[PDB]
Design a protein around this ligand. Structure first.
Ligand code: CHL
Ligand code: CLA
Ligand code: CLA
Ligand code: CLA
Ligand code: CLA
Ligand code: CLA
Ligand code: CLA
Ligand code: XAT
Ligand code: LUT
Ligand code: LUT
Ligand code: LUT
Ligand code: 13X
Lengths: 41, 160, 74, 74, 231, 221, 229
């Protein structure tokens, strides 16, 4: 189990997971808050 | 098929064929069982899973299967040196073949009979596909007219 | 397409398949008697393309596959 | 895995059944995009009451030649 | 000892050498395994015994003297000389005082044994759960046999109260009324005669208590104890 | 030694599963608890899941029994919607936030106990909330928390045999309840009825009322 | 032992022959455990004695009351009336449940610990002398038919019990397949054996799907999936 978690912590796996999480978060932000041209607060 | 051909069972000879029992619904099915064939297969899968898995584990570890509790039945799962011949208190109730030579002879009988049965099963499947009838019916029709009713004579009609 | 019989209804029923290809009323007897000409209805050597679909004749492709299969097996 | 994906997309996100009834006017399509940032414009009006990306792999023709007809088979 | 709740069995380890009265080695769940918990449960059992005895005796006397008043609905159909709010408050205050004193006496034996108003009066030394002194001015016989009698009668009274409430929820009658009904037809008045469950059907006796009862200006639930679980 | 989840076959039994843990049968074909800290975390998760599943299954079963008797108790798959309908003055977001906050407080107490086995048995809490330990030879904390509040009857205080028997009872019932909840979800998704409804319909007509006749498990049938 | 159930079978080691009716059977190995062997022996004795009583009762009621079928002799409408009390199956079940529970708990306690409940609950002097499990004696043996060859009588009892169990299974299957009594089946077979045998009667479930017992519906079923008449 330790070796598996160590493999999941490698640079490529972590890079792909981080990019996927960031892309998913951005996609959902644009899905619920679309066409945000300016920062209207 | 033999029992139905003689009228012993209340099933017609064409309905008592093995490939029309329900194993292959497209080829025919007997819809009078106490429960549908799929649920029967579910029970079959559970039971056969238990039996086959225990047999496989005994093959891997001959000493196993007789140590863990199994409602007291594990006492007859000790097996022997050969996985194909456990013959303990249950698999060899009558204690047939007490001497090694007699056991070898009986094993030869079993192997020859099993090989003949394998060949017969394959033949039954082929005949059913090419004659659309049962093995007993095929044998009777061949006996009535052997020169006409045979493999060469049935090439014109195979799935009719 | 919803009215055409299912593939098993054609694969396991020589009567319907014979209705579509009459050479099938003879079964496998012509194949074993070396009278392959009887199978000329579904084993053609036409050529060109099908004027309805614009593609090759499926019978020609069947014949082609059978010939190359025999050649490869040999 | 790639082949399974192709068949699954042709069975769940395609107009193969509708294309069979009109293979000369309905444009084959086997991909549907989600509406996120105006990209739903990529879902073209291929035909048969379906919207999606026009495919050029020729899978519809292959399936028709094989007699798929239904989406359950895919 | 020779008196066992299951003849031929063996007393549990924690119940061996048990000096508590009415100790017949009954503890399948081992709730009395802990020593402190055993004493707390002993006090709880004694108080339950006495409360159940008083309640059963009161219900029986009320039914005999006033057979037209249902004990189950007596809380809302008696016409109180005072007010329900004031009565409940007074009872809560006095009960809090007495119960707190008793519980603290159990927690600490001689902590609650002195009269707070009259410094000259003090309860003599005693055993937990048995005050004595002014509480027991008359003792007819030895204390051990009387203690056993009290424990046994209390257990019987608790079972009697449960039977009373269940009979009232099933038949809607008073204890003696239900007994008379059962005597008029023993083979037709038992629980096995009114309820029965089989793989395919289940017969559940209807509730003899109304779904809700109206008291003063509000509504009180008062239905059946887990009617959906009834056989 | 001990009974295994697969008679014989000692190769599949992992080395870290030596039989000291309650409910240990050598079951771990995927090696999800190979690491020691991972095994401890999984033990905590398993006992917590078992207790939560037992509570949920008991509530679902009681509500289904009450619904069959005619009480105004809705089914488990629609209890939330029904309650929200009879109480239009209760905001859904407010209820969710309150549940999350209270559960977060108790879960943070348990979490800190997981990080430090005996750190919550002081301060704003008595020594009873320190834990009795058990797994991994621990003598403090863990999923088994004694005291006078999480064990008022003191069933684990006195005779280790009784404690072991009760622990085995708890883990077996928890696993059974987890499987029961999974079955409840599958049955509701396939037939659309409650647990008691499925049980009575099956007992009334054994054959013709199996998973093959629900139209979901077996699609073509 | 000596003679076994089958010619030439190897008797299990635990089946020395000391126990009555030991014929070196147990092909399933259920008797390899001594404690389980004792429990199974008690179960065999109970089943054999109950089967003996049941078979004797069925035959006796058929000889004395041939108009009543033993299979349906339990319905309330067929229950004999000895007084003016109403018929309530629930009330009858109460008496039997209470008495059976008490006697069975006493026997069970004796099985757990031998000679533990051998004394009267009210009179400790009154004791039951049971030399072995399943054989209490004393009040249960008023005629004193023991004393002598106890093993021979034990063998007779176990063999009669086994025969009675087989006979009861036969009675159940025959009643479910023919709808008659055992004696009636024997009489019918002696008339036209070629047309009144198991070959023709099997495959028929002469029992209704359900029965109405004063409002309560009891689902009925044969021992095998028959044709339901
Ligand atoms: C201490 C024991 C005690 C017991 C065993 C009972 C038992 C009962 N009371 Mg009573 N009461 C008791 C004390 C007292 N009651 C009352 C005042 C009332 C009233 C005014 C009423 C009852 C009612 C009832 C019945 C409610 C049935 C039910 O399912 O309710 C379900 C339980 C509840 C609704 C309360 C739950 C919370 C509670 C335990 C605290 C029931 C038989 C009701 C009745 O007549 O029902 C037919 C009723 O209307 N009681 C007072 C104040 C003087 C009491 C003081 O000690
Ligand atoms: C430096 C270049 C640049 C910049 C400044 C922007 C800026 C913007 N783009 Mg754009 N875009 C770019 C490049 C750029 N883009 C490129 C190269 C492409 C081709 C792939 C696109 C394709 C594109 C599309 C299709 C869309 C945008 C949209 C937007 C607007 C949405 C803002 C938002 O997401 O809400 C707010 C987001 C947040 C508050 C999240 C902030 C917190 C994050 C998670 C931190 C990230 C940490 C790492 C925004 C003004 C959307 C729009 O509506 O246009 C107006 C939209 O539909 N862009
Ligand atoms: C003609 C086929 C045939 C033959 C010659 C044998 C021969 C043998 N088998 Mg085998 N067996 C067979 C079919 C056969 N088997 C089939 C189809 C199965 C699948 C169920 C098995 C499964 C099987 C197992 C699991 C084992 C054997 C074993 C053995 C050996 C033990 C000696 C023995 O019992 O002789 C066989 C005697 C006969 C074949 C004559 C009987 C023929 C009649 C028609 C059978 C009637 C049986 C009937 C159900 C009886 C019910 C009541 C009965 C208990 C009194 C022996 C060499 C055991 C072994 O290996 O010993 C160490 C053992 O472990 N067999
Ligand atoms: C691998 C390719 C293939 C397969 C699976 C089949 C299968 C089938 N063909 Mg077919 N056929 C083929 C190629 C094939 N064909 C080709 C290339 C031609 C052109 C010559 C034909 C021309 C043809 C005709 C004219 C007819 C069939 C028919 C049939 C059906 C029954 C025939 C049969 O013998 O049963 C199944 C065959 C096998 C299981 C092959 C097993 C091989 C041996 C014989 C058994 C195992 C070896 C043995 C133990 C030693 C059957 C489903 C008949 C039919 O019913 O129409 C629907 C029919 O009339 N075929
Ligand atoms: C092997 C080639 C292949 C390729 C290139 C695609 C490509 C695509 N698929 Mg597909 N798929 C494939 C195989 C493939 N699939 C197979 C074999 C199956 C059967 C299991 C499916 C079943 C499937 C479904 C059910 C769906 C898609 C969908 C999609 C589209 C969006 C996927 C997405 O972003 O989801 C999300 C991206 C993620 C990273 C999350 C994925 C999480 C999963 C569970 C991981 C599983 C491992 C996309 C164009 C979606 C679609 O068509 O939209 C209309 C859609 O719903 N696919
Ligand atoms: C989430 C619930 C849960 C958790 C956390 C655990 C955790 C644990 N179990 Mg346990 N178990 C459970 C449920 C659970 N179990 C249930 C319901 C059963 C009854 C079938 C069992 C039966 C069981 C046995 C017989 C044994 C264990 C054992 C163990 C311990 C070692 C195994 C391990 O390390 O892997 C950790 C397990 C997990 C991390 C859970 C992974 C879940 C996967 C990733 C999802 C797939 C699950 C399922 C197949 C898919 C359904 C999901 C979908 C339908 C929604 C460990 C602490 C062994 C032991 O030694 O006991 C101490 C042992 O002998 N378990
Ligand atoms: C192992 C062989 C075998 C198997 C699997 C079956 C299976 C079946 N039989 Mg059958 N039967 C058999 C042997 C067998 N039989 C023999 C040897 C005879 C001659 C006496 C009969 C005479 C018979 C009749 C008269 C009937 C059936 C019927 C049936 C069907 C319903 C079951 C039932 O109630 O009948 C009875 C069960 C048995 C006879 C099992 C006893 C067979 C041996 C002794 C044990 C195995 C069922 C699928 C019924 C049917 O056709 O349904 C429409 C039906 O009425 N069977
Ligand atoms: C927690 C849980 C359920 C809890 C349910 C609750 C609270 C229900 C709550 C409510 O219902 C009420 C009361 C009222 C309703 O109105 C509303 C809701 C809110 C719905 C189930 C867990 C259920 C958890 C389950 C079923 C887990 C199964 C895990 C298995 C089988 C794993 C096995 C293995 O992992 C091992 C052990 C070793 C590995 O190496 C190999 C494999 C094989 C992977
Ligand atoms: C184990 C044991 C142990 C113990 O101890 C004892 C005992 C009991 C003895 C045991 C058991 C045993 C057994 C089970 C046996 C069985 C066997 C068999 C079944 C065989 C068969 C066997 C079988 C066989 C061979 C078969 C064969 C067949 C054949 C040839 C067929 C033929 C044919 C064909 C093709 C088709 C056509 O159209 C017709 C015909 C002509 C008809
Ligand atoms: C021991 C043990 C141990 C093991 O181990 C386990 C187990 C099993 C758990 C166990 C057992 C248990 C049990 C049995 C319990 C029970 C109890 C009870 C019943 C109580 C009651 C109890 C009861 C009670 C108190 C009661 C009381 C009553 C009363 C007061 C009454 C009152 C009244 C009156 C007068 C009149 C009015 O008008 C009304 C009223 C108001 C109503
Ligand atoms: C040995 C062994 C070992 C190895 O290892 C394995 C194996 C093979 C398993 C084995 C074998 C086994 C067997 C054979 C068994 C069987 C049993 C039986 C039959 C029982 C019955 C048993 C039986 C019984 C109890 C019965 C009883 C009866 C009775 C009470 C009756 C009653 C009655 C009467 C009077 C009349 C009326 O009206 C009706 C009724 C109500 C009906
Ligand atoms: O739940 C309680 C236990 C105890 O020992 C004392 C108390 O007052 C309450």
């Amino acid at each position: 189990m330790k070796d598996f978690t160590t493999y999941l912590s490698t640079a490529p796996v972590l890079t792909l997971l981080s990019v996927t999480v960031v892309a998913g978060l951005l996609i959902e932000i644009n899905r619920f808050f679309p066409d945000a041209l300016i920062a209207a607060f | 098929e033999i029992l139905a051909t003689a009228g012993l069972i209340p099933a017609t000879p064409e309905e008592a064929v093995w490939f029309r029992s329900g194993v292959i619904p497209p080829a025919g099915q007997y819809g009078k069982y106490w429960m549908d064939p799929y649920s029967l297969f579910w029970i079959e899968a559970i039971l056969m899973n238990f039996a086959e898995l225990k047999r496989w584990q005994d093959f891997k570890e001959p000493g196993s299967q007789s140590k863990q509790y199994f409602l007291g039945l594990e006492a007859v799962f000790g097996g022997s040196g050969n996985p194909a011949y456990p013959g303990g208190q249950w698999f060899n109730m009558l204690n047939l073949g007490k001497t090694p030579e007699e056991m070898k002879k009986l094993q030869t009988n079993e192997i020859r009979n099993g090989r003949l049965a394998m060949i017969a099963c394959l033949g039954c499947a082929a005949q059913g596909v090419m004659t659309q009838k049962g093995p007993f019916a095929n044998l009777l029709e061949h006996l009535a007219d052997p020169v006409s009713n045979n493999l060469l004579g049935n090439l014109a009609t195979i799935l009719k | 397409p919803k009215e055409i019989p299912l593939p098993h209804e054609f694969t396991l029923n020589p009567e319907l398949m014979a209705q579509l290809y009459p050479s099938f009323s003879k079964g496998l007897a012509p194949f074993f008697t070396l009278d392959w000409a009887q199978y000329s209805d579904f084993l053609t050597f036409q050529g060109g393309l099908n004027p309805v679909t614009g593609g090759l004749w499926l019978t020609d492709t069947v014949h082609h596959h059978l010939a190359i299969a025999v050649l490869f097996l040999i | 895995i790639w082949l399974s994906g192709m068949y699954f997309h042709g069975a769940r996100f395609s107009n193969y059944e509708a294309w069979l009834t009109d293979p000369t006017h309905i444009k084959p399509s086997a991909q549907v995009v989600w509406p996120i940032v105006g990209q739903e414009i990529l879902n073209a009006d291929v035909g048969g009451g379906f919207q999606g990306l026009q495919i050029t792999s020729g899978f519809f023709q292959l399936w028709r030649a094989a007699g798929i007809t239904s989406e359950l088979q895919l | 000892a020779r008196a066992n709740w299951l003849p031929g069995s063996d007393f549990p380890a924690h119940l061996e050498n048990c000096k508590l009265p009415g100790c017949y080695g009954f503890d399948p769940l081992g709730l009395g395994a802990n020593e402190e918990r055993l004493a707390w449960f002993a006090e709880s059992e004694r108080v339950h015994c006495r409360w159940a005895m008083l309640g059963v005796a009161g219900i029986l006397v009320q039914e005999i003297v006033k057979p037209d008043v249902f004990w189950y609905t007596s809380g809302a159909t008696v016409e109180l000389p005072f007010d329900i709010t004031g009565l409940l408050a007074f009872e809560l205050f006095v009960m809090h005082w007495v119960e707190s004193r008793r519980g603290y006496d159990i927690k600490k034996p001689g902590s609650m044994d002195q009269d707070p108003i009259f410094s000259n009066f003090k309860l003599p030394a005693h055993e937990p759960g048995y005050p004595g002194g002014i509480f027991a001015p008359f003792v007819p016989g030895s204390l051990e046999e009387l203690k056993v009698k009290e424990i046994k009668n209390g257990r019987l009274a608790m079972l009697a109260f449960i039977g009373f409430t269940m009979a009232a929820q099933v038949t809607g009658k008073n204890p003696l009324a239900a007994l008379r009904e059962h005597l008029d037809n023993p083979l037709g008045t038992t629980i096995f005669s009114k309820a029965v469950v089989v793989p395919g059907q289940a017969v559940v006796p209807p509730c003899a208590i109304p779904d809700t009862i109206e008291f003063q200006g509000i509504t009180i639930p008062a239905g059946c104890f887990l009617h959906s679980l009834w056989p | 030694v001990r009974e295994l989840w697969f008679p014989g076959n000692k190769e599949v039994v992992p080395d870290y599963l030596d039989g000291s843990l309650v409910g240990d049968h050598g079951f771990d074909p995927l090696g999800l608890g190979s690491s020691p800290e991972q095994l401890s975390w999984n033990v905590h998760a398993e006992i917590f899941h078992g207790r939560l599943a037992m509570t949920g299954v008991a509530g679902i079963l009681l509500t289904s029994l009450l619904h069959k008797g005619g009480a105004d108790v809705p089914e488990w798959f629609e209890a939330g919607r029904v309650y929200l309908d009879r109480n239009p003055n209760v905001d859904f977001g407010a209820l969710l936030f309150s549940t999350i906050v209270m559960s977060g407080f108790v879960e943070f107490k348990r979490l800190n106990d997981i990080r430090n086995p005996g750190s919550q048995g002081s301060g704003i809490l008595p020594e009873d909330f320190k834990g009795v330990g058990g797994p991994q030879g621990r003598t403090v904390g863990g999923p088994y928390v004694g005291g006078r509040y999480f064990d008022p009857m003191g069933l684990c205080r006195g005779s280790p045999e009784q404690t072991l028997k009760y622990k085995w009872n708890e883990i077996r019932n928890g696993r059974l309840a987890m499987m029961a909840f999974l079955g409840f979800a599958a049955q509701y998704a396939a037939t659309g009825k409650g647990p008691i409804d499925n049980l009575v319909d099956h007992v009334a007509d054994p054959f013709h009322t199996t998973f093959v006749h629900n139209g979901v498990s077996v699609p073509f049938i | 032992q000596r003679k076994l159930w089958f010619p030439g079978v190897a008797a299990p080691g635990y089946l020395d022959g000391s126990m009555a009716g030991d014929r070196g059977f147990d092909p399933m190995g259920l008797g390899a455990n001594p404690k389980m062997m004792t429990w199974y022996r008690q179960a065999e004795l109970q089943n054999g004695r109950w089967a003996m009583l049941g078979v004797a009762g069925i035959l006796g009621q058929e000889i004395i009351n041939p108009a009543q079928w033993w299979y349906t002799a339990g319905m309330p409408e067929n229950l004999p009336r000895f007084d003016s009390q109403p018929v309530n199956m629930g009330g009858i079940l109460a008496w039997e449940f209470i008495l059976m529970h008490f006697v069975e708990v006493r026997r069970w306690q004796d099985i757990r610990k031998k000679d533990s409940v051998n004394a009267d609950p009210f009179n400790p002097n009154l004791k039951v002398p049971n030399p072995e499990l399943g054989y209490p004696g004393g009040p249960f043996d008023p005629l004193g038919f023991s004393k002598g060859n106890f093993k021979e009588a034990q063998t007779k009892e176990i063999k009669n019990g086994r025969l009675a169990m087989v006979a009861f299974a036969a009675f159940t299957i025959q009643a479910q397949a023919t709808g008659k009594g055992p004696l009636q089946n024997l009489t019918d077979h002696l008339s036209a054996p070629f047309s009144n045998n198991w070959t023709t009667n099997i495959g028929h479930c002469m029992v209704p799907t359900s029965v109405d017992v004063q409002g309560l519906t009891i689902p009925l079923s044969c021992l095998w999936p028959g044709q339901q008449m």
